[PDB]
Coordinates of C-alpha atoms in Angstrom, one line a residue:
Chain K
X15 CA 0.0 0.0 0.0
X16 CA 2.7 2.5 -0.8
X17 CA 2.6 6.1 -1.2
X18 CA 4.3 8.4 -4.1
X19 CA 6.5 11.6 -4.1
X20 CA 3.4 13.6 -5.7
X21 CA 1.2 11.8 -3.4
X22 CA 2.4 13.5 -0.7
X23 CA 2.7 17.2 -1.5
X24 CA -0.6 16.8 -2.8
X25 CA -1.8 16.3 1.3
X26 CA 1.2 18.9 2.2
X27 CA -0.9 21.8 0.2
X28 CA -4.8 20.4 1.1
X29 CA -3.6 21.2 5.0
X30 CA -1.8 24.8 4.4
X31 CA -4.9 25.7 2.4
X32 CA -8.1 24.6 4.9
X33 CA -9.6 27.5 6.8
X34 CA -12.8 27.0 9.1
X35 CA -14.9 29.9 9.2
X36 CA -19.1 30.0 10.8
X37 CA -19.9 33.8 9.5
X38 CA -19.2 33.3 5.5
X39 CA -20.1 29.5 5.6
X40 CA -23.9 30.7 7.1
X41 CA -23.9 33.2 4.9
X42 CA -23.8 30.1 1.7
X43 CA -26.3 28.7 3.3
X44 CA -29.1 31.2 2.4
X45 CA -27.6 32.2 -0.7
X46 CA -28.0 28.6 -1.5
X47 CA -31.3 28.3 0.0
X48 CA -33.0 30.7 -2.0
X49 CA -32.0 29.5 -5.7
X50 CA -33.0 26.0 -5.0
X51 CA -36.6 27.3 -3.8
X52 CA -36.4 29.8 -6.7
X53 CA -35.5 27.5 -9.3
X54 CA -38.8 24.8 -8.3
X55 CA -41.6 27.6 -8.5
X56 CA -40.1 28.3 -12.2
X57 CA -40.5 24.6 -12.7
X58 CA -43.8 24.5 -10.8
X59 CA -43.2 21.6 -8.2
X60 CA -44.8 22.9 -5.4
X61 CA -46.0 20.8 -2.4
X62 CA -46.3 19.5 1.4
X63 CA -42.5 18.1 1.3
X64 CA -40.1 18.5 4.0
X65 CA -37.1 18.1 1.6
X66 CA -37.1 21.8 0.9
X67 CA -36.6 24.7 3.5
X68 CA -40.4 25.5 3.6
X69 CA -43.4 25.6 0.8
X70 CA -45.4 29.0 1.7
X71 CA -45.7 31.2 4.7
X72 CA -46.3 34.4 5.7
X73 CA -44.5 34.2 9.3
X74 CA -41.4 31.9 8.3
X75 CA -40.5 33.1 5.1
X76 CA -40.4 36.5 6.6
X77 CA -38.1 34.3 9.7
X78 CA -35.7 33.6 6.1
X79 CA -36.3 37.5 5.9
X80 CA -34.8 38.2 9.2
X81 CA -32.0 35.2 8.9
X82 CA -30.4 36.9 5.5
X83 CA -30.7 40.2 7.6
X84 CA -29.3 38.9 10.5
X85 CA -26.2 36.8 9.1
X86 CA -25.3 39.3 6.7
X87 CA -24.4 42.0 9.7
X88 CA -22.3 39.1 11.6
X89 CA -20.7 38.9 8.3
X90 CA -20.1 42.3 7.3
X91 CA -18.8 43.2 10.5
X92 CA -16.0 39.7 10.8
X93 CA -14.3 41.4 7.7
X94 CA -14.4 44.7 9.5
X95 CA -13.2 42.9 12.3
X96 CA -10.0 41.3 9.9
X97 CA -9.5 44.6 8.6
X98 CA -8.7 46.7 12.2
X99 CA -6.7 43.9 12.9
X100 CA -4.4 43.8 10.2
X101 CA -4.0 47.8 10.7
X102 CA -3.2 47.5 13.7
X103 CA 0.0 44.5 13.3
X104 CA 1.3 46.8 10.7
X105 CA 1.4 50.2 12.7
X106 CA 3.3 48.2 15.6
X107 CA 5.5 46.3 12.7
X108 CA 6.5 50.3 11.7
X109 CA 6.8 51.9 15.1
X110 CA 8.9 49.0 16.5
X111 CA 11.2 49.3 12.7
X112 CA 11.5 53.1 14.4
Chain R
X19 CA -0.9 41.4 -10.5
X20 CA 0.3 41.2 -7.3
X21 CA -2.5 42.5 -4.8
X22 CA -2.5 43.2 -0.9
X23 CA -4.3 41.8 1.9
X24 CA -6.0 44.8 2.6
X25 CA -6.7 45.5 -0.8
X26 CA -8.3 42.2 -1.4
X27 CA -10.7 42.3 1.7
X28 CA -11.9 45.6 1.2
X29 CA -12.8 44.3 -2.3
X30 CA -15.0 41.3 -0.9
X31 CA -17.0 44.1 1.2
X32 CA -18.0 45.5 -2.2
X33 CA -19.0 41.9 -3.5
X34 CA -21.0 41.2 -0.5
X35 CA -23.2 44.7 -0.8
X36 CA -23.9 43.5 -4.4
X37 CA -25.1 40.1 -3.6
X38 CA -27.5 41.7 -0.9
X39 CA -29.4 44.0 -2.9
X40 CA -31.0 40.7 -5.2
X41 CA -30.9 39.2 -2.5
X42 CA -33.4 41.6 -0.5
X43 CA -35.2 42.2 -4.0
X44 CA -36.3 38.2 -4.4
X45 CA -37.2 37.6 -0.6
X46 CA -40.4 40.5 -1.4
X47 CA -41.8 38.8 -4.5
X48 CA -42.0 35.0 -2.2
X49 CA -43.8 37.4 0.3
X50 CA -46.3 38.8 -1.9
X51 CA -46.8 35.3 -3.3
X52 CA -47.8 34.6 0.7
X53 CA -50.4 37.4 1.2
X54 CA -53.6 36.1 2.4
X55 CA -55.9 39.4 1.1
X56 CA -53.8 39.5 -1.8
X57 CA -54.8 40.6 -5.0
X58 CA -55.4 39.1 -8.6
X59 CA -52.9 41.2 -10.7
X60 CA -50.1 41.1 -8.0
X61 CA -49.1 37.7 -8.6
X62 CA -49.4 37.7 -12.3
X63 CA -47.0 40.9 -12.2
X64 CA -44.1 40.0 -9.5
X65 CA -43.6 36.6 -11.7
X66 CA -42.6 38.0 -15.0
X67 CA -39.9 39.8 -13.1
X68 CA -39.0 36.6 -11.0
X69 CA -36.7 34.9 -13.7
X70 CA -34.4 38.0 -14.5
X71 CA -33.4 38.3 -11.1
X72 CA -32.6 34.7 -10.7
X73 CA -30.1 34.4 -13.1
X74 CA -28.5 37.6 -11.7
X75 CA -28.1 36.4 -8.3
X76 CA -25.9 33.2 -9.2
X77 CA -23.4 35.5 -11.0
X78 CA -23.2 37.8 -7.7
X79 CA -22.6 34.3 -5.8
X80 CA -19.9 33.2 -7.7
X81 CA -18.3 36.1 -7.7
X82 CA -18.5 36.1 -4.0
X83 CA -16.8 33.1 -3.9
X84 CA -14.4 34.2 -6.0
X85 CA -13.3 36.8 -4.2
X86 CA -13.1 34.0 -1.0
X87 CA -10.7 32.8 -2.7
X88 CA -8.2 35.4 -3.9
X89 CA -7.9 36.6 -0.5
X90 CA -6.9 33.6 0.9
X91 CA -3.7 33.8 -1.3
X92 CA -3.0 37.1 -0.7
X93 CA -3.7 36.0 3.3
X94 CA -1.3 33.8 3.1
X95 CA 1.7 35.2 0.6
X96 CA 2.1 37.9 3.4
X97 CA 2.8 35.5 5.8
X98 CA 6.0 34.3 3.8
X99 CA 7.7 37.5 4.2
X100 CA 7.3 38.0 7.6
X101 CA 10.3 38.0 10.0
X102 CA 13.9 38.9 8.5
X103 CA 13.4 40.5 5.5
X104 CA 10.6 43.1 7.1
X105 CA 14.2 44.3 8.9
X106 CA 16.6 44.4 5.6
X107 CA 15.6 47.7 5.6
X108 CA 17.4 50.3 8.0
X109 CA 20.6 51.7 6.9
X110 CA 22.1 52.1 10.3
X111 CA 24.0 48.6 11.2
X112 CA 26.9 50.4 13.4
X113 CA 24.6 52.3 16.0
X114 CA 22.7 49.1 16.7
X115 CA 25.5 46.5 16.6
X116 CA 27.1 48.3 19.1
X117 CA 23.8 49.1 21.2
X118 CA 23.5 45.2 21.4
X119 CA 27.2 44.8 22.2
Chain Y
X30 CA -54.3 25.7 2.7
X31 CA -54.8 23.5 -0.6
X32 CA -56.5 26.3 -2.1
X33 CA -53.5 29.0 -2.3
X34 CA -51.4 25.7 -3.0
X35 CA -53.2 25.4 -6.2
X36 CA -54.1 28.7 -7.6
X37 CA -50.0 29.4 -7.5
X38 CA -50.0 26.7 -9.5
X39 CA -52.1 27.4 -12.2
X40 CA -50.2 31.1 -13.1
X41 CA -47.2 28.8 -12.8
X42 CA -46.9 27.0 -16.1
X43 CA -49.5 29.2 -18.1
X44 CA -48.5 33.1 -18.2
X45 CA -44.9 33.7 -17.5
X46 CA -42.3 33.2 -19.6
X47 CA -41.7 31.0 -22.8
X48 CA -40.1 27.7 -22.0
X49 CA -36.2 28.3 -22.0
X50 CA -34.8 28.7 -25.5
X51 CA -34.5 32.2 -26.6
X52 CA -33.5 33.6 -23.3
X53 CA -30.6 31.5 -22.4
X54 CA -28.2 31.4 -25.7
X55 CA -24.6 32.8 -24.1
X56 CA -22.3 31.2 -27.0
X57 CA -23.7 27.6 -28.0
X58 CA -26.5 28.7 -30.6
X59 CA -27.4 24.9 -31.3
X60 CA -26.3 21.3 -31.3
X61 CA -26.7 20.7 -35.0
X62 CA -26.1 23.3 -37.3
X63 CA -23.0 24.6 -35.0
X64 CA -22.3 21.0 -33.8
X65 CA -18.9 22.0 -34.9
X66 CA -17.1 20.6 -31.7
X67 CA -13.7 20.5 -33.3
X68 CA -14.4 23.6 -35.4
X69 CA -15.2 25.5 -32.5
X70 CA -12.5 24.4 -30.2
X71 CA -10.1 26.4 -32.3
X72 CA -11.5 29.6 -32.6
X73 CA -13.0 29.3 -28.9
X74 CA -9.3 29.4 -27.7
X75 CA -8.4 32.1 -30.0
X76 CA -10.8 34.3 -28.1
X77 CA -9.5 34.2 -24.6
X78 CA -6.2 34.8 -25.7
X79 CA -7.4 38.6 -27.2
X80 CA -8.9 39.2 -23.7
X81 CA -6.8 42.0 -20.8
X82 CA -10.2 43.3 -19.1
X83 CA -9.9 40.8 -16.3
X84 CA -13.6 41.7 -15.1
X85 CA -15.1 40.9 -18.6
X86 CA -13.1 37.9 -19.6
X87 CA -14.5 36.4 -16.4
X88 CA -18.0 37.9 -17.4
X89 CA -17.2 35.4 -20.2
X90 CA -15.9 32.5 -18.4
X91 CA -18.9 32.3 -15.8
X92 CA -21.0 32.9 -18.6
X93 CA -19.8 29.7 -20.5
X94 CA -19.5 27.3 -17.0
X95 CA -23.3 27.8 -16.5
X96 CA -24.5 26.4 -19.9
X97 CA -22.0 23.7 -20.0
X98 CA -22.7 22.5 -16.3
X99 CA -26.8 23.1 -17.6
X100 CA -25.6 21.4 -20.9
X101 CA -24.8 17.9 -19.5
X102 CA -27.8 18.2 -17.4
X103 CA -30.4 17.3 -19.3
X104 CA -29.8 13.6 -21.2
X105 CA -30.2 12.5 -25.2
X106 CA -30.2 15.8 -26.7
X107 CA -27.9 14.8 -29.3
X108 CA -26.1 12.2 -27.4
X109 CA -25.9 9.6 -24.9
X110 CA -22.8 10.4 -23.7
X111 CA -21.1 14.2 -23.4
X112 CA -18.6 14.5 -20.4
X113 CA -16.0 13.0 -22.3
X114 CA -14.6 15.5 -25.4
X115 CA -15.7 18.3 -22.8
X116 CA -12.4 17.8 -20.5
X117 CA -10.1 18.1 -23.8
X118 CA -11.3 21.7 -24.1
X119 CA -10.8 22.5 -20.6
X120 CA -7.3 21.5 -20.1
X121 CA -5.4 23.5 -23.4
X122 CA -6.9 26.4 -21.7
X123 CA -5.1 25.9 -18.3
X124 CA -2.2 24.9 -20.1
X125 CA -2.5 27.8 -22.3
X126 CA -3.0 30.6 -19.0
X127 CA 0.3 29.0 -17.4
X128 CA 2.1 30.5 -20.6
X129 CA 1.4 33.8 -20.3
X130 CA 0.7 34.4 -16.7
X131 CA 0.7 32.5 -13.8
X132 CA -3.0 32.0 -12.0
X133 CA -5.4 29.6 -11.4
X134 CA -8.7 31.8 -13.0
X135 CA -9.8 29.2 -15.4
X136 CA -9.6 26.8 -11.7
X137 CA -11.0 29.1 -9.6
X138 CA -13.9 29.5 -11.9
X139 CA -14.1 26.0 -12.0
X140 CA -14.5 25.4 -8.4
X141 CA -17.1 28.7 -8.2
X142 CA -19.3 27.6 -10.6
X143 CA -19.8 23.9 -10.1
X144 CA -20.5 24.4 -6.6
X145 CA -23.2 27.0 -7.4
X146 CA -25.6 26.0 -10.2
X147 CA -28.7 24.3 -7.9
X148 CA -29.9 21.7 -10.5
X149 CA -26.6 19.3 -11.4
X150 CA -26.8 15.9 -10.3
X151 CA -24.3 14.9 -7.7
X152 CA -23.3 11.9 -8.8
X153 CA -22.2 13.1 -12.7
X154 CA -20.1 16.5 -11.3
X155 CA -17.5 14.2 -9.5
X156 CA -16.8 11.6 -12.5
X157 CA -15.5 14.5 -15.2
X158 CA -13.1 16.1 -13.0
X159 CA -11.5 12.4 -12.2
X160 CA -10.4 13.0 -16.1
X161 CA -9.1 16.6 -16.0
X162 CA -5.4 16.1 -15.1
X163 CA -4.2 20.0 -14.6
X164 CA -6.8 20.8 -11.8
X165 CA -5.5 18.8 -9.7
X166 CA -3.1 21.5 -7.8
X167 CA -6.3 24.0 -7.5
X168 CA -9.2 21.1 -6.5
X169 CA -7.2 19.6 -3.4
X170 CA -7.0 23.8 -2.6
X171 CA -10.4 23.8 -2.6
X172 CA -14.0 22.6 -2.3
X173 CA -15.4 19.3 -1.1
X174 CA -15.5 17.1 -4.4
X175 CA -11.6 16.4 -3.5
X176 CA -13.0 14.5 -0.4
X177 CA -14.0 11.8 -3.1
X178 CA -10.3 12.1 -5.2
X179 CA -8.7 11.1 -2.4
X180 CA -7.7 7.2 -1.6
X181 CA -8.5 5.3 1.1
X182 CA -5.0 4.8 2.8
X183 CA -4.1 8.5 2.1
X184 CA -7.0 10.4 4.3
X185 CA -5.4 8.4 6.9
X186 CA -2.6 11.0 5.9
X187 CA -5.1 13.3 6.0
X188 CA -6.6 13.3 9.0
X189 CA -3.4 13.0 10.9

């Protein structure tokens, strides 16, 4: 059961390039769970299914309203978040060069 | 071309706003498909508009995605240089070799 | 609740839109007049070459990666079998962006794409890139159809 040269820098550059992150990964998850609903009513399949997020409301499709509202500011401000930070190592990296 | 960190992520912010607004604009028409007094021409009119924005929201998702991933090269081609070549820069070697000595 | 069930139902197939044709023609016209598939690899290649706007030439890359993922969607158009002669055309590309510059945009917009369009099967999306060779360096990079390249002794590799 051997292993090759290329097989091995192949799993060397899978590991350096992995990154978890929960505020752009929910974010997918309504982008993605609008075209699928969107693309069955241009079809027309429409019924009492629990495959699907949900078939018609008035309360919880308005809850989908406040869930792209919601995960979009956690979002928006985790890249603000990335973007103080890397300010602030390069001001210390400058102050500390004088 | 070579691009920054900063530069890339403040780019993705611009992306996101994008995705957002068809976002919002789709999310209206599957509530006036839910009205219960709702009226006969209002869902004969919010349909015809429902394909055009469909479309248009998977090219502002891939390019969201796209932009996912040119920042995570730039994250981590920064992160190379970091250490002794941030330093090959000061042109005063004898007033610190002697400070240390 | 069967009521407003239905009468969605019945503005559904009857008064939107035509059934898609016309609307949805980005570069492949037809399958038989244009059929063409070595007469068009040539002068398909040709055209990205004469491309420096870097928004619009991926304008034109997502543009193609939707029809072609929505092409080998549907079965027996013209032919049983499609996935096959679609991998050749891929690959010169790659081959032909490493010349010039040095990027992964022809991967990258492999990886967006096929992870985005909502109506692919799973099963076919995994079996074509098996057969492109030079994605190889940009699919373990990225998203989770290189879970099912990988061997059985080497996640073992993996997961230590």
């Amino acid at each position: 059961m051997p292993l090759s040269q290329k097989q091995i820098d192949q799993v060397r550059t899978k590991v350096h390039y992995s990154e978890v992150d929960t505020p752009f990964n929910k974010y997918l998850d309504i982008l993605g769970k609008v075209t699928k609903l969107t693309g069955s009513i241009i079809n027309g399949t429409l019924s009492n299914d629990d495959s699907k997020i949900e078939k018609l409301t008035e309360q919880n499709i308005s809850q989908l309203k406040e869930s792209a509202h919601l995960r979009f500011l956690d979002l928006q401000s985790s890249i603000d978040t990335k973007k103080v930070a890397d300010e602030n190592w390069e001001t210390c990296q400058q102050e500390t060069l004088a | 071309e070579g691009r920054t960190y900063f530069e890339s992520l403040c780019e993705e912010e611009q992306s996101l706003q994008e995705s957002q607004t068809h976002l919002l604009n789709i999310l209206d028409i599957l509530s006036v498909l839910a009205d219960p007094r709702s009226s006969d021409d209002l869902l004969t009119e919010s349909l015809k508009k429902l394909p055009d924005l469909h479309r248009e929201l998977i090219n502002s998702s891939i390019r969201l995605r796209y932009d996912k991933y040119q920042t995570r090269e730039a994250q981590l081609l920064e992160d190379t240089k970091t250490g002794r070549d941030v330093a090959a820069g000061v042109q005063n070697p004898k007033s610190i070799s002697e400070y240390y000595s | 609740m069967a009521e407003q069930t239905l009468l969605s139902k019945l503005n559904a197939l009857s008064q939107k839109v035509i059934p898609p044709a016309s609307p949805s023609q980005a570069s492949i016209l037809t399958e038989e007049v244009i059929r063409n598939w070595p007469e068009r690899s040539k002068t398909l290649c040709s055209d990205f070459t004469a491309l420096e706007s870097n928004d619009e030439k991926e304008d034109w890359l997502r543009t193609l990666f939707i029809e072609l993922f929505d092409f080998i969607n549907k079965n027996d158009e013209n032919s049983p079998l499609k996935l096959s002669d679609v991998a050749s055309f891929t690959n010169e590309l790659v081959n032909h962006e490493r010349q010039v510059s040095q990027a992964s945009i022809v991967g990258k917009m492999f990886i967006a794409v096929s992870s985005t369009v909502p109506n692919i099967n799973d099963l076919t999306t995994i079996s074509l890139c098996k057969l492109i060779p030079s994605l190889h360096e940009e699919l373990f990079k990225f998203s989770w159809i290189s879970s099912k390249l990988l061997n059985k002794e080497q996640t073992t590799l993996l997961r230590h």
